[PDB]
Design a protein around this ligand. Structure first.
Ligand SMILES: Nc1ncnc2c1ncn2[C@@H]1O[C@H](COP(=O)(O)OP(=O)(O)OP(=O)(O)O)[C@@H](O)[C@H]1O
Ligand SMILES: Nc1ncnc2c1ncn2[C@@H]1O[C@H](COP(=O)(O)OP(=O)(O)OP(=O)(O)O)[C@@H](O)[C@H]1O
Lengths: 48, 96, 116, 204, 403, 359
């Protein structure tokens, strides 16, 4: 019971670490994409 | 080099065990149940497709499937399916 | 990424909403299937399967059996008023029609004492 | 006007077809499964500070019998076994949950002569059966199914012979395997068919 | 069930100490700690040992997986307790691993040493094979641990080790280090450890290294110099060596892609068939120079011998649970070669099965993870050696509570 | 939404980087000290009364105790964070390099109990520091005040088997400086003035680049006497300390407490890692901590790791230009994150499991 739990927990912990790392990478990439989208928002405000 | 064929035996045995814990089902009975599942699937899908096409619609939506269930299932059998589907959709969009 | 959750679990269905939507999107039934169509279809399929399985198990317990067989499915489908209406055109392999009772033979005629 | 106000899909489907105060604390606890009273610690809730340790129920020890010196000297006397040679067996049984595959290894071969697994198990079961036969009221399973150590010995020997088969008893053994069917078919289909055909020729 | 404890996995190469219930040990440092007789000073930190100073003759507090210097053992325990653990031993039970071939005299002396010096609340001394089986999800099975000093196949049946089935072979990390030494000496490669290098310049492949020697050198011993050289050799092993898929064939060995590696001094060269001829000695010690002798049992031979000395009734289970662990097991293609040899040797009836744990953490720290999950069980609470048990029954209590 | 409410803390023994999260800088900080009568104050008041109070550091090279000292640290942090809990408070606290169980369990339990927070979390400073940039692996030096972490955080997981540390980050460096002074010019001789002493390094922190130049920095005899000024105005022309104790960090033997230099310390730290992973360990070396500003540390680390590392691997430095609070920046990037809401600990899972949660 406890060994299956520990193995699943190790796998889930590594998965969550991958999740958080990919999430911070997404945060940075989305910050830059948000700068680009602020330029596009200037364009869209001209359009409006 | 395997030629795997799919089936609903996995969701039907589960349903059977959740509704009848002590009663099993034979392989041929499982095949008959799968055939019924596929037949009802085809019927509902075709009815929803035709209903959407009548209204000049290119998308089958939950409303089309709901009206198709109203049409196909007879008497006091449609209502239950419609209620189950609505309660599943409401519980699905609620992010549970 | 976040722990992936299936669509059958979200709605609360046993039958596969994923495989349903799969068969639908590449089944040519439409051009762009809606997100809710497969959920509703799987829910109705699950309800009908649960009902027929309940009836088949009841028939099996009445017949004193544990494994459901085409006999039980046929009996359940032809006994229910609405399932028979839904499956009137359907025929089942190794099935049978509803039988008649032979007790009527006894109080009309049986073998006599002649050379018994 | 349309009431709506809810989710698009659910809305269409429905209408279109009309303070905590429980502190965790580091608590000491005594395990009833122990006789030394060792005090351990556990992360428990505040609502159960003092409750018995639940895992103590998982302490069902094996039922190894205990007997007195007089009982031994009277009934369990054996020419090939002495008290120093017998008590150790039951000690190991009590210590390792009465499994003889581990007890054999634990046998002290320095002070004691070498013993196999089967003879150790036989001695143990014989001691148990004697203790039962010399007991009437406690109902110690008087009719114990003591295994036959000789049958067990020959089984251990024949399967060990079947174990080492590398050169030809595992690869060329396919020949004897095919022969298992050939002799069960060819012998019959030859001799019994000869009898049948002789009877036919007699009738013919 | 889970109580604040400290699981100690004192291996011959590295010692792993951490809290029970964790997925990895809290600290992992080399066991060959440097020593200076000043009492004697010991350094139990990688940053405090591999340093260009402080002669630090390597005492290796343990050898052959058993304690050999109780003073150095006390020193390393103290350092592990107040360097990374940083907690009073009297507040945490201790579950420590032991070699299966550990004598009772040691066991008892170690037990008493942790009650009259550290005054720990509870103690337990479990065998490494039992812990390995415990971690990999098997109560019965064969534990193949190819450590630094020896490669051993330890058959575990129902959580207990079968001593009669223990088979050991000296073909271990030490043998690989010796073979790498011989290879370097044959190829005219000067093994220069890092502490002797002041600076280096990039040179072409195969050309002499262009490095400058530090003027203010440390006062190192032959032991510490050999220790640094062995660390470099182990890095080379982890970087280059690869086990041959099948029996070593010189013709096939010359058709494999080479592996590039640069020594600390800058010398770099590609290795062809020499990197696949060294790991062959582990499985086939016949084709080994200087090892003239056939008594040495290879990995597969060790496994087959360990399984053969056990009762046939459990040999099927042993073959069905053959757990592979140890640092040497991390060499590339080692697992494949082992599985192939065992399938060729294992009889057909015996279903051979190799547990699929091959990660560095899963392999090198298997023994520690075993005790980590063993001390986190509520059932294990009734097996502890309590201070009262030791005070009453004495040092010999280790033989009854944890045989 | 814990994102818009996020709170972060990094106490250590150098400076308490705490306050409301959401911005790219600490809302407010205090030197993380507590004081009591000799025969209670915290934060700036304790720093002001250091000459008359019995100051103690609730953080001791990583070890922390929260019944009065760290509890008062948190009570002062309450001034930096938002006011009474129900307003805004997802709380992540300051974990040490490696003291997972003892620190995490007790800290979480006692903080939940005291502040009653419906939300909280815990994590090591290493991952939250690496999140400042975002990449596969980091060997962050994290030389703060009481610890010099060698954390090889591969894929955001602090590998403990390869984790090492050094002790010359904060008070050791400042003490070595204070004792090198008064051997060369003015100085002080008490902890009451160690702050004005470290105020010499907070402005002049050029490194010597020893072992490659090793004499020319001082032999130039020009453009090195920046003459740091004391409150009185003394112009003693700060000398070899311009080159002494930037290297004591990289050469502990220079101080007297001996250990692997920071460069070789991190080198060994990555050497203990896997052989297939150590590739991106060289090319993703990050530097964190207040003691890492030291503009010359970048080139020194490059040179030393190149000397030790193989030629095939290049030493790519990505040390943020504002690495002063790299820990806080990445910690807020992690906490202030909408999709991170599902990983916080609340009353429900607390009551079901308790502080004995995975940690
Ligand atoms: N990455 C690697 N690749 C290949 N071999 C390695 C690697 N790391 C270590 N080794 C080898 O493994 C050996 C270390 O073995 P290990 O420390 O796993 O044994 P151990 O667990 O200490 O054994 P025991 O518990 O009996 O002391 C070293 O001698 C080294 O040669
Ligand atoms: N402006 C500055 N310029 C240069 N160095 C500075 C400056 N401000 C602070 N420092 C140095 O940074 C150190 C502060 O350490 P810091 O607060 O980063 O420790 P910490 O990492 O929070 O604690 P721990 O090491 O326990 O994690 C001080 O010792 C000081 O010498």
């Amino acid at each position: 019971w406890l060994s299956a739990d520990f193995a699943q927990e190790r796998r889930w912990k590594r998965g969550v670490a991958r999740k958080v790392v990919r999430m911070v990478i997404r945060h940075h990439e989305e910050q830059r994409q948000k700068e680009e989208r602020a330029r596009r928002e200037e364009q869209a405000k001209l359009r409006r | 080099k395997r030629s795997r064929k799919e089936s609903y035996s996995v969701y039907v045995y589960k349903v059977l065990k959740q509704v009848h814990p002590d009663t099993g089902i034979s392989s041929k009975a499982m095949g008959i149940m799968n055939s019924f599942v596929n037949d009802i699937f085809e019927r509902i899908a075709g009815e929803a497709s035709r209903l959407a096409h009548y209204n000049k619609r290119s998308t089958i939506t939950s409303r089309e499937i709901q009206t198709a269930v109203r049409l196909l299932l007879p008497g006091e059998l449609a209502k239950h399916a419609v209620s189950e589907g609505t309660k599943a959709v409401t519980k699905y969009t609620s992010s549970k | 990424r976040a722990k992936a959750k299936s669509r059958s679990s979200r709605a609360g269905l046993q039958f596969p909403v994923g495989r349903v939507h799969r068969l639908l999107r590449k089944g040519n039934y439409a051009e762009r299937v809606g997100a809710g169509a497969p959920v509703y279809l799987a829910a109705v399929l699950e309800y009908l399967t649960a009902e027929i399985l309940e009836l088949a198990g009841n028939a099996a317990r009445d017949n004193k059996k544990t494994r459901i067989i085409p006999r039980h499915l046929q009996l359940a489908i032809r006994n229910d008023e609405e399932l028979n209406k839904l499956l009137g055109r359907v025929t089942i392999a190794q099935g049978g029609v509803l039988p008649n009772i032979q007790a009527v033979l006894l109080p009309k005629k049986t073998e006599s004492h002649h050379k018994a | 006007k349309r009431p709506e106000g809810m989710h698009r899909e659910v809305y269409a489907l429905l209408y279109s077809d009309k303070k905590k105060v429980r502190p965790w604390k580091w608590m000491p606890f005594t395990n009833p499964a122990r006789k030394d009273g060792a005090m351990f610690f556990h992360w428990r809730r505040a609502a159960e500070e003092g409750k018995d340790y639940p895992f103590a129920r998982f302490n069902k020890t094996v039922q190894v019998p205990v007997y007195s010196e007089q009982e031994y000297q009277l009934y369990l006397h054996d020419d090939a076994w002495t008290k120093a040679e017998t008590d150790h067996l039951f000690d190991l049984s009590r210590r390792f949950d009465l499994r003889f595959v581990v007890i054999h290894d634990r046998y002290d071969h320095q002070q004691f002569k070498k013993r196999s697994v089967e003879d150790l198990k036989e001695r143990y079961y014989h001691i148990c059966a004697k203790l039962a036969n010399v007991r009437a009221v406690p109902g110690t399973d008087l009719k114990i199914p003591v295994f036959d150590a000789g049958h067990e010995r020959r089984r251990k020997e024949q399967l060990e012979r079947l174990y080492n088969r590398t050169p030809e008893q595992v690869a060329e053994e396919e020949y004897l395997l095919q022969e298992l069917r050939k002799i069960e078919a060819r012998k019959k289909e030859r001799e019994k068919r000869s009898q049948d055909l002789q009877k036919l020729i007699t009738a013919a | 069930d889970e109580v604040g404890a400290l699981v100690f996995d004192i291996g011959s190469y590295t010692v792993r100490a951490g809290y029970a219930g964790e997925d990895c040990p809290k600290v992992d440092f080399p066991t060959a700690i440097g020593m200076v007789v000043e009492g004697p000073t010991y350094y139990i930190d990688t940053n405090a040992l591999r340093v260009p100073r402080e002669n630090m003759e390597a005492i290796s507090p343990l050898k052959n997986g058993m304690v050999e210097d109780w003073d150095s053992f006390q020193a390393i325990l103290d350092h592990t307790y107040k360097m990374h653990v940083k907690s009073e031993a009297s507040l945490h039970p201790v579950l420590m691993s032991e070699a299966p071939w550990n004598t009772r005299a040691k066991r008892e002396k170690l037990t008493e040493l942790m009650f009259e010096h550290y005054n720990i609340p509870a103690f337990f001394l479990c065998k490494t094979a039992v812990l390995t089986a415990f971690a990999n999800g098997r109560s019965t099975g064969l534990i193949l641990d190819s450590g630094a000093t020896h490669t051993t196949a330890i058959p575990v049946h129902d959580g207990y080790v079968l001593q009669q089935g223990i088979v050991k072979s000296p073909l271990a990390g030490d043998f690989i280090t010796m073979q790498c030494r011989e290879l370097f000496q044959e190829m005219n490669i000067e093994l220069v450890p890092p502490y002797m290098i002041a600076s280096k310049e990039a040179v072409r492949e195969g050309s002499p290294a262009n490095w400058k020697r530090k003027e203010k050198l440390p006062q190192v011993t032959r032991s510490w110099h050999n220790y640094m050289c062995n660390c470099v050799i182990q890095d080379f092993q982890a970087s280059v060596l690869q086990v041959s898929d099948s029996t070593y064939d010189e013709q096939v060995a010359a058709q494999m892609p080479t592996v590039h590696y640069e020594f600390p001094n800058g010398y770099n060269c590609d290795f062809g068939a020499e990197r696949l001829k060294i790991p062959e000695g582990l499985f086939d010690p016949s084709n080994v120079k200087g090892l003239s002798g056939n008594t040495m049992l290879g990995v597969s031979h060790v496994v087959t011998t360990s399984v053969g000395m056990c009762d046939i009734d459990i040999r099927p289970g042993l073959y069905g649970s053959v757990i592979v662990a140890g640092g040497n097991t991390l060499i590339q293609s080692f697992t494949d070669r082992l599985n192939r040899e065992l399938s060729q040797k294992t009889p057909p009836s015996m279903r051979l099965k190799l547990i699929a744990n091959n990660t560095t953490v899963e392999r090198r720290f298997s023994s520690w993870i075993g005790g980590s999950i063993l001390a986190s069980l509520g059932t294990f609470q009734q097996m502890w050696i309590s201070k009262q048990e030791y005070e009453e029954g004495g040092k010999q209590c280790v033989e009854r509570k944890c045989p | 939404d814990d994102d818009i409410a996020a709170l972060v803390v990094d106490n250590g023994s150098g400076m308490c980087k705490a306050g409301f999260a959401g911005d790219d800088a600490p809302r407010a900080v205090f030197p993380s000290i507590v004081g009591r009568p000799r025969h209670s104050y915290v934060g700036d008041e304790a720093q002001s009364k250091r000459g008359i109070l019995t100051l103690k550091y609730p953080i001791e090279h990583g070890i922390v105790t929260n019944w009065d000292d760290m509890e008062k640290i948190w009570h002062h942090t309450f001034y930096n964070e938002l006011r009474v809990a129900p307003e805004e408070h997802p709380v992540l606290l300051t974990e040490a390099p490696l003291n997972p169980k003892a620190n995490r369990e007790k800290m979480t339990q006692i903080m939940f109990e005291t502040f009653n927070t419906p939300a909280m979390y815990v994590a090591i400073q290493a991952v939250l520091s690496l999140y400042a940039s975002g990449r596969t692996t980091g060997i962050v030096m994290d030389s703060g005040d009481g610890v010099t972490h060698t954390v090889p955080i591969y894929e955001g997981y602090a590998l403990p088997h390869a984790i090492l540390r050094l002790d010359l980050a904060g008070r050791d460096l400042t003490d070595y400086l204070m004792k090198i002074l008064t051997e060369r010019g003015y100085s002080f001789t008490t902890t009451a003035e160690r702050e004005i002493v470290r105020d010499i390094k907070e402005k002049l922190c050029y490194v010597a680049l020893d072992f490659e130049q090793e004499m020319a920095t001082a032999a130039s005899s020009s453009s090195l006497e920046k003459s740091y000024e004391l409150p009185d105005g003394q112009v003693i022309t700060i000398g070899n300390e311009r080159f002494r104790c930037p290297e004591a960090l990289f050469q502990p033997s220079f101080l007297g407490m001996e250990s692997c230099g920071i460069h070789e310390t991190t080198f060994n730290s990555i050497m203990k890692c896997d052989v297939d992973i150590r590739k991106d360990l060289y090319a993703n070396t990050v530097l964190s901590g207040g003691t890492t500003m030291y503009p010359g540390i970048a080139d020194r680390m490059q040179k030393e790791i190149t000397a030790l590392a193989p030629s095939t691997m290049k030493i790519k430095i990505i040390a943020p230009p504002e690495r002063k609070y790299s820990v806080w920046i990445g910690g807020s990037i992690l906490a202030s994150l909408s999709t991170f809401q599902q990983m916080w600990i609340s009353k429900q899972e607390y009551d079901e499991s308790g502080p004995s949660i995975v940690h």
